[PDB]
Design an enzyme around this catalytic site. Structure first.
Site, mmCIF file in Angstrom:
data_model
loop_
_atom_site.group_PDB
_atom_site.id
_atom_site.type_symbol
_atom_site.label_atom_id
_atom_site.label_comp_id
_atom_site.label_asym_id
_atom_site.label_seq_id
_atom_site.Cartn_x
_atom_site.Cartn_y
_atom_site.Cartn_z
ATOM 1 N N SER A 188 -0.654 15.620 -12.024
ATOM 2 C CA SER A 188 -0.942 15.175 -13.520
ATOM 3 C C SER A 188 -1.095 16.400 -14.369
ATOM 4 O O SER A 188 -1.628 17.365 -13.835
ATOM 5 C CB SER A 188 -2.131 14.216 -13.461
ATOM 6 O OG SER A 188 -2.553 13.934 -14.871
ATOM 7 N N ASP A 222 0.695 -1.046 0.017
ATOM 8 C CA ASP A 222 0.102 0.106 0.042
ATOM 9 C C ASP A 222 0.859 1.315 -0.140
ATOM 10 O O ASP A 222 1.314 1.710 1.052
ATOM 11 C CB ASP A 222 -0.869 -0.107 1.188
ATOM 12 C CG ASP A 222 -1.880 1.376 1.268
ATOM 13 O OD1 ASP A 222 -1.901 2.169 0.248
ATOM 14 O OD2 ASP A 222 -2.357 1.336 2.387
#
Length: 330
Positions: free
Chosen positions: A199, A35
């Protein structure tokens, strides 16, 4: 040193991935959910409330000659889906794919929430975010990667998750045969403890690319792709009959649909998520309403590039002094 381990979807939907981890002496192998969005290595154990164990493999520290109670230490964690676990702490030897860390904090669960109990395939979590998020008190502990880092050939790990297929986590090297083209690296902020990056935009299907900064985290421990409501609405508007359902808890779409792809930007590069990756199947057995793999982050407080996004790429988690993230197509 290096390590290399195969990671395998837990079910036919890729709801999560498990990777075998050796703990203790002799080895006890547990299948852990790696994770990159948290920083605790915790396991089902011989200390876990018996009624909260249902099929998991447990770690039994008393059977490990290298286990030592970390005296006074406790831990307690809550995740974004409302699940939780807590307990005490041992140090022990932990190996992943041939890479061995001695003195790793292994957090032994005394209590786990229902979601964990109900998932017989996940024996615990192995956190790979920054150690500043680790919940052990009163002495915060380091992640497996943080402990291994100095010994690694290069201070990196990579995630290569498969679509409906096994993939690989590598530690300490970049497998140049595992991706196509070049790797595009992008800046990371560690201010919130995550692999947080920005992004450069998105496209829906064959549509034009929209240049826009989207701050989010690369999180292998989250199944879906959670993005701003504007972006998600633009995606689902291209699917006839798709709608956001408060009763279901997100966007659903007719199971008869062909989903469009979704592209996200990494610098000047582009990662394409095929439409099929966005299908999470019937909301309930036999239903013709299917659950979407792109959902709104509104009310989460953060955008999450979860498995839906990450499995479309070869992803480098670069833990150099200034960390960065790299993405390549594959």
């Amino acid at each position: 040193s290096t390590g290399s381990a195969t990671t395998t979807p837990i079910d036919s939907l890729d709801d999560a991935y498990i990777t075998p981890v050796q703990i203790g002496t002799p080895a006890q192998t547990l299948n852990l959910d790696f994770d990159t969005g948290s920083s605790d290595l915790w396991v089902f154990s011989s200390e876990t409330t018996a009624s909260e164990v249902d099929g998991q493999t447990i770690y039994t520290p008393s059977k490990s000659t290298t286990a030592k109670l970390l005296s006074g230490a406790t831990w307690s964690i809550s995740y974004g889906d409302g699940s939780s676990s807590s307990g005490d702490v041992y140090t022990d030897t932990v190996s992943v794919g041939g890479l061995t860390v001695t003195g790793q904090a292994v957090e032994s669960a005394k209590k786990v929430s229902s979601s964990f109990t109900e998932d017989s395939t996940i024996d615990g979590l192995l956190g790979l975010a920054f150690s500043t998020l680790n919940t052990v008190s009163p002495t915060q502990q380091k992640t497996f990667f943080d402990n291994a880092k100095a010994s690694l050939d290069s201070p990196v790990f990579t995630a290569d998750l498969g679509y409906h297929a096994p993939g690989t986590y590598n530690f300490g090297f970049i497998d140049t045969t595992a991706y196509t083209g070049s790797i595009t690296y992008t800046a990371v902020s560690t201010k919130q403890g995550f692999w947080e990056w920005t992004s450069t935009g998105y496209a829906v299907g064959s549509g034009t690319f929209k240049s826009t900064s989207i701050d989010g985290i690369a999180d292998t421990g989250t199944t879906l792709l959670y993005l701003p409501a504007t972006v998600v609405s633009a995606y689902w508007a291209q699917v006839s009959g798709a709608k956001s359902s408060s009763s279901v808890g997100g966007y659903v779409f007719p199971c008869s649909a062909t989903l469009p792809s979704f592209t996200f930007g990494v610098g000047s590069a582009r990662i394409v998520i095929p439409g099929d990756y966005i299908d999470f199947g019937p909301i309930s057995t036999g239903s013709s309403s299917c659950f979407g793999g792109i959902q709104s982050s509104a009310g989460i407080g953060i955008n999450i590039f979860g498995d839906v996004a990450l499995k479309a790429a070869f992803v480098v988690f670069n833990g150099a002094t200034t960390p960065t993230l790299g993405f390549a197509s594959k």
